[PDB]
Amino acid sequence: GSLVCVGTGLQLAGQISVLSRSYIEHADIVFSLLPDGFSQRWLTKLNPNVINLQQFYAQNGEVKNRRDTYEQMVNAILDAVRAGKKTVCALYGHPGVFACVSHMAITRAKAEGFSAKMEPGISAEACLWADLGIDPGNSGHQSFEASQFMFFNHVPDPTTHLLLWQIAIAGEHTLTQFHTSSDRLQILVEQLNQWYPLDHEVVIYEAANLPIQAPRIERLPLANLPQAHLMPISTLLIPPAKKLEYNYAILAKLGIGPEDLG
């Protein structure tokens, strides 16, 4: 058996790479995690032998640590590989960006002596640059999982675009809920206020998943974040709050100055 993990992008049908679509078409079996039923139908027509990984999420009002869900997803994929199937995992976006199931399956597969590889796809970040007309080369960029930003020590560069992923579950430490509470978001606001004024404009971004759908690009002051409507697919963009300062020691050594910069 073998494993290839591919991404389908965010937009239905059209945002998958040509090669990745081919991998899906030729697979013995496909394990899928897609944004909606429209995507699921599209995939089923590409390859009828699909297992929907969504089934491993909590159902019927049961409580479940998301770590256990991921483990079950990985076990399911590996079971197919071990059985001898040419297995493809089809995840939305990029299968290796803020996505542990792919990395976990590939690590485990290699360890068990199986061929495993990941094909890059178009991530939410990639969609954000296009939709907001931001070239991240301009002032740089940085990405953190919102909860990790809260639970561990991270310091953002406030001269650079800051992306907080999984903002909807920021601070939800049990890993069982799909939403956090307003009090948790308020704690995040106060934390971010080390670098960002309370009136600093931030953006709640959601890339469209359907061709007839416009992206969500909601601008609001940071202070209002705890009252905003956030969804699982929401990403928070925090534009720069501080102006660039010259690295005089380095400029001097390179023999250049502000004159010929910007």
Partner: protein
Amino acid sequence: MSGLSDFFTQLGQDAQLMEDYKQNPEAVMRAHGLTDEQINAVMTGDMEKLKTLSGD
């Protein structure tokens, strides 16, 4: 039963249809047989309703 799925899949991957749609959304949607209800949901951006008119 409806043709919402078939339409969205084609529109998502075909640049000619995409450009036609962006030119005249309502005319393109009627030409693919979308109901007034479906077209209204698209135009008002109600994704939750669209997913109801597909056959979840």
